[PDB]
Amino acid sequence: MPKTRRRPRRSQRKRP
RNA sequence: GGGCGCCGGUACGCAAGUACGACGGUACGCUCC
Numbered sequence: 001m002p003k004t005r006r007r008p009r010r011s012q013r014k015r016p
Numbered sequence: 017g018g019g020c021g022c023c024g025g026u027a028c029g030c031a032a033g034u035a036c037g038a039c040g041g042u043a044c045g046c047u048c049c
């Protein structure tokens with residue numbers, strides 16, 4: 001499995 | 017191009033990491049023309 005991330009899949013990121 | 021996974025680079029760091037909707041994708045692994 002690849003490295004563990006935090007900021008999600010772009011689609012989610014609404015309000016800056 | 018976009019999705020899902022994820023990442024760059026931004027924090028933090030000794031450098032790689034681990035954070036992180038800093039703010040930018042979709043590269044690279046699959047999927048749809």
